[PDB]
């Protein structure tokens with residue numbers, strides 16, 4: 001949960017800072033979860049189109065996750081001596097001979113991962129109402145004064161109790 | 171392929187009796203043995219000038235082109251496939267009997 | 275209708291062939307009874323020639339059906 | 344006297360008619376007998392078995408099954424050498440039949456009569472007479 | 483053995499036999515008597531060797547009584563079938579004389595006679611091998627020529643010298 | 652012990668170091684489902700067919716045999732197969748490959764018996780493997796090239812299914 | 826060769842050793858099912874069985890229930906499946922009360938403590954599997970139809 005969140009946090013920030021050549025033309029000006037929705041609209045099965053970004057990410061991540069799943073099963077039943085998260089990925093030496101890493105480093109990974117989980121959750125939720133994205137929301141410390149329009153999420157029922165029960169300032 | 175024509179895993183058709191299912195040899199030989207006579211062509215509308223095996227293979231190809239849509243009730247796919255499978259099952263059964271039992 | 279032919283020496287040829295074929299087969303496969311001069315009797319000869327007229331009739335009719343004649 | 348657990352069982356290919364979990368948790372019955380031949384008999388629970396020459400031993404779930412087989416061996420193979428036991432899951436083996444070495448249809452000394460009523464059956468007491476009373480209807 | 487090297491040696495054949503190449507992939511030699519198999523190979527080869535020339539000769543010279551039939555193979559239809567029956571009966575009668583009452587595998591070789599030998603001559607292994615190998619080639623060639631004449635409907639020599647069209651049916 | 656390919660995963664027991672092309676890569680443990688010798692022969696047979704196919708696609712783009720163009724004018728890869736099925740060119744190949752596979756079945760039986768090594772038909776006419784030290788390199792190189800060729804063949808045919816031009820034409824004009 | 830034999834060498838037990846009953850393939854399936862798999866606590870056995878059963882339960886209620894043609898069909902399908910699961914958990918609970926006397930051991934299903942653990946796992950798993958099926962059907966239009974979205 002931490003590792004994904006860490007990537008997610010940076011990714012949102014980086015997406016605001018700059019985008020790779022040509023992406024802006026196809027997607028348009030959609031910013032965070034909205035880009036996931038837009039890409040899905042233009043991909044087969046999910047929608048009609050000539051794109052496969054979300055599906056390709058899922059296929060390669062899925063192949064990695066099936067292998068890790070076998071590892072999780074083996075560790076759970078005690079067959080393997082591997083500690084949690086120790087997949088051996090230390091290409092640039094940092095642990096000085098062990099990919100597992102020192103206790104100091106693993107503490108840094110765990111605490112940054114927890115912090116990232118909270119931060120990315122905040123960023124997603126802030127995009128849900130302001131529609132500003134991480135950097136723009138940071139610039140606008142007084143917010144709800146100005147709201148950048150955002151297309152509705154694929155799960156839109158959850159954003160229905162804003163107006164009736166909550167104040168609905170936005 | 172629970173067990174092939176070899177002493178790999180300790181397979182037991184039942185509680186204490188090991189028995190070599192010859193799934194490669196029986197499946198391959200039954201497939202070929204049934205297919206070569208089945209090639210025999212016939213100028214019948216079901217076959218269309220091909221044999222049963224060739225027409226069955228052609229029917230898979232024509233219905234696979236319309237991949238989501240299933241073959242219709244009057245489509246020749248259902249007759250061709252049922253006869254081909256029935257013959258294949260019969261030659262697999264007879265092949266398993268002959269090879270496993272007579273061993274030669 | 276499947277096409278049959280009036281009797282000719284070709285029909286006779288098929289019949290003769292089938293009868294002889296079954297006489298030799300009967301010398302081989304009849305389990306209860308000089309390759310043809312041991313134990314060959316009237317019921318064996320009459321059985322192999324009865325199967326000869328069955329195999330021969332089927333062969334004549336089929337070869338007429340497909341065009342071999 | 345005690346059941347020799349090592350006696351070889353008659354050859355049998357198995358059946359679904361044999362004993363179930365109640366035999367291994369409540370009680371089982373065993374029968375032994377001597378055969379002069381290696382001959383086929385019918386199992387009370389199913390098909391046919393072959394009794395071995397010498398001593399045979401079976402396990403059945405009911406006492407009636409052991410005695411139905413006993414009746415059969417005596418009637419057809421004239422084997423009167425059969426002993427019927429009850430076996431509890433505690434390991435206790437209880438000899439059953441013939442209870443004192445002599446068949447019940449033959450009289451034996453030292454047998455005490457149980458259940459014998461001194462009058463004829465028409466001399467029993469009416470139900471009303473023994474109502475709200477513990478007294479038995481057999482006089 | 484030596485012919486199909488990724489398979490075992492048959493171990494029912496040896497170089498003593500005239501045409502040994504170690505070629506028995508299906509293991510037929512184990513299933514049936516080698517003496518019968520050798521007899522069958524030489525006999526089938528002899529008939530096929532006669533057959534190949536039998537296909538070639540009518541195209542040039544044919545007997546006056548019989549009709550050409552438009553193909554050496556097709557001629558069987560044109561000729562009287564009583565002729566064909568006389569050939570069938572004659573071959574069987576010759577077989578009964580040559581094999582003296584032996585029409586079955588047990589009866590054959592009872593006398594100790596070698597399969598190829600019918601008493602015409604005794605030969606060297608070099609000579610015997612030559613006979614078997616020509617016969618083997620002839621059997622395959624007979625199948626090729628018969629189908630060529632059947633599909634083309636034209637003679638072998640005419641097709642070789644002329645169009646040489648691919649056999650099509 | 653751990654798999655060399657996937658460090659986190661335990662080493663697949665059915666696989667052994669001696670086997671050519673072994674990297675410890677069997678995450679799903681499919682070697683337990685079926686005999687390893689059967690799978691080893693299956694992998695090499697797929698490898699050899701794939702290698703031929705990939706080379707064929709490159710060669711077919713580079714040049715065509717004399718008179719082939721008249722029968723097939725514009726078809727490039729999978730397209731030539733349909734017209735040549737009616738021409739009987741594919742039919743003839745099928746017949747002869749099937750004929751070889753009949754003896755292949757007997758070879759497969761010998762492998763399962765354990766006398767025969769998987770994938771060995773003793774076809775080394777030029778004596779390349781005579782040294783026995785060049786043999787180990789050759790066995791490995793065959794397995795590796797065939798694995799790449801399977802990926803290559805699928806990659807090329809799928810490129811043709813999108814841009815119908817063949818692998819070399821796709822490289823020149825995308 | 827003979828494929829049918831007495832059960833566990835005993836000719837007089839009420840069972841036979843048939844290929845369906847005692848083949849290597851059958852032994853592998855039975856031994857690896859959560860009910861019989863070694864190294865599993867009774868609670869984990871309950872969780873795995875519960876996830877499987879709760880997941881398939883949602884589908885028949887949703888597609889064939891009284892509110893199937895309504896736009897609230899999936900919500901009705903989840904609630905009816907959950908209602909069935911609540912009844913089934915009560916069936917498990919009452920069975921545990923009568924069948925097993927109280928003892929210290931808790932590592933086996935056929936113990937009072939173990940059966941209680943199985944019920945706890947089955948309840949959580951059934952709710953979790955029914956919930957997972959609900960999320961998947963709610964979001965993916967292929968599952969809402971029988972695959973009929975493609976035609």
Ligand code: CLA
Pocket residue numbers: 195196199200203256257258260261262264265266267268269272273274
């Ligand atoms: C459908 C195909 C077919 C048929 C008809 C036969 C028939 C036969 N096989 Mg063969 N066999 C087959 C496929 C077949 N086999 C294959 C695929 C293999 C390889 C794996 C073998 C390998 C094999 C060996 C190794 C041996 C045989 C033997 C035999 C004979 C007796 C044993 C037997 O199987 O009893 C079958 C009995 C009969 C077929 C006759 C009974 C008549 C009834 C009507 C049976 C009909 C069944 C069914 C409806 C027919 C379907 C035909 C078609 C529509 C599929 C018998 C002639 C043995 C033998 O005698 O050696 C020569 C022997 O040693 N077979």
Ligand code: CLA
Pocket residue numbers: 294295298518521522523525526529569570571573574575577581584585586
């Ligand atoms: C009356 C005729 C007759 C008789 C009794 C024999 C007897 C014999 N022949 Mg000879 N043969 C004959 C005619 C005959 N032949 C003719 C006309 C030919 C064609 C030139 C041959 C070609 C021939 C060859 C090539 C071989 C024999 C062999 C044999 C021996 C074993 C097989 C057998 O018993 O014959 C059974 C056969 C017949 C009685 C007549 C066969 C005539 C041909 C083959 C027509 C076949 C029709 C068709 C293919 C059958 C289809 C069956 C089924 C589909 C219905 C035996 C000594 C074999 C051997 O080992 O010899 C020692 C052997 O290799 N024969």
Ligand SMILES: CC1=C(C#C/C(C)=C/C=C/C(C)=C/C=C/C=C(C)/C=C/C=C(\C)C#CC2=C(C)C[C@@H](O)CC2(C)C)C(C)(C)C[C@H](O)C1
Pocket residue numbers: 005006007009010089090091092093094112113115116117118119120121122123126133134135137138
């Ligand atoms: C492991 C390994 C490798 C590697 C690697 C990699 C790729 C490592 C990547 C690490 C990363 C990307 C870590 C990022 C963590 C993010 C955090 C802690 C921030 C959370 C956000 C917060 C608190 C916030 C907020 C906010 C709120 C909600 C409102 C928003 O409007 C705005 C705001 C931002 C103000 C390598 C290859 C180097 C080799 C090596 O041998 C081993």
Ligand SMILES: CC1=C(C#C/C(C)=C/C=C/C(C)=C/C=C/C=C(C)/C=C/C=C(\C)C#CC2=C(C)C[C@@H](O)CC2(C)C)C(C)(C)C[C@H](O)C1
Pocket residue numbers: 531532534535602603616617619620622623624625626627630638641642
């Ligand atoms: C027994 C013995 C002696 C003797 C004797 C006798 C009777 C000897 C007779 C021997 C004979 C008749 C031999 C015939 C061989 C034919 C062969 C090898 C095939 C050739 C054709 C090929 C390869 C081809 C082809 C073709 C194909 C398929 C397709 C076509 O489109 C093209 C083409 C034409 C090229 C005597 C009695 C003298 C004495 C001695 O004491 C014992």
Ligand SMILES: CC1=C(C#C/C(C)=C/C=C/C(C)=C/C=C/C=C(C)/C=C/C=C(C)/C=C/C2=C(C)CCCC2(C)C)C(C)(C)C[C@H](O)C1
Pocket residue numbers: 033034036037117118120121122124153154155
């Ligand atoms: C891609 C996609 C989607 C998406 C998406 C995503 C990524 C959604 C993100 C969801 C997340 C990560 C929400 C975070 C919730 C964290 C909360 C409520 C507070 C936690 C910490 C607490 C309570 C601290 C407690 C405490 C503190 C103060 C310290 C003391 C102790 C302690 C008790 C620990 C959608 C849904 C938009 C759909 C759309 O189609 C596209």
Ligand SMILES: CC1=C(C#C/C(C)=C/C=C/C(C)=C/C=C\C=C(C)\C=C\C=C(C)\C=C\C2=C(C)CCCC2(C)C)C(C)(C)C[C@H](O)C1
Pocket residue numbers: 728729730732801802804805806808
């Ligand atoms: C495991 C692993 C990885 C990986 C990976 C992956 C996902 C590899 C994927 C490989 C795949 C999916 C290959 C697919 C197909 C091969 C084909 C279709 C050959 C087809 C022949 C055809 C279609 C002819 C068809 C036809 C003919 C001509 C006749 C007419 C009809 C027609 C149907 C057109 C990495 C990348 C992480 C690396 C890592 O180190 C290990």
Ligand SMILES: CC1=CCCC(C)(C)[C@H]1/C=C/C(C)=C/C=C/C(C)=C/C=C/C=C(C)/C=C/C=C(C)/C=C/C1=C(C)CCCC1(C)C
Pocket residue numbers: 558621622624625626628
């Ligand atoms: C009309 C007529 C008249 C009277 C009635 C009748 C008798 C019924 C009828 C006769 C009809 C007749 C006479 C019919 C005769 C028909 C004949 C002789 C057919 C020949 C077939 C030979 C083939 C298919 C060769 C196959 C070679 C292969 C598979 C490969 C071999 C290979 C191997 C083994 C090893 C090396 C590699 C190679 C070399 C490639």
Ligand SMILES: CC1=CCCC(C)(C)[C@H]1/C=C/C(C)=C/C=C/C(C)=C/C=C/C=C(C)/C=C/C=C(C)/C=C/C1=C(C)CCCC1(C)C
Pocket residue numbers: 876877878880881949952953954956957960
């Ligand atoms: C196929 C086939 C072919 C051959 C013959 C055959 C074998 C008979 C036949 C098989 C047929 C059969 C019978 C196939 C049967 C297949 C079945 C019933 C599969 C059940 C799968 C259950 C799943 C994925 C549950 C997932 C729950 C999750 C992820 C938890 C989620 C939750 C938790 C608690 C965590 C928090 C979030 C939430 C969401 C709340």
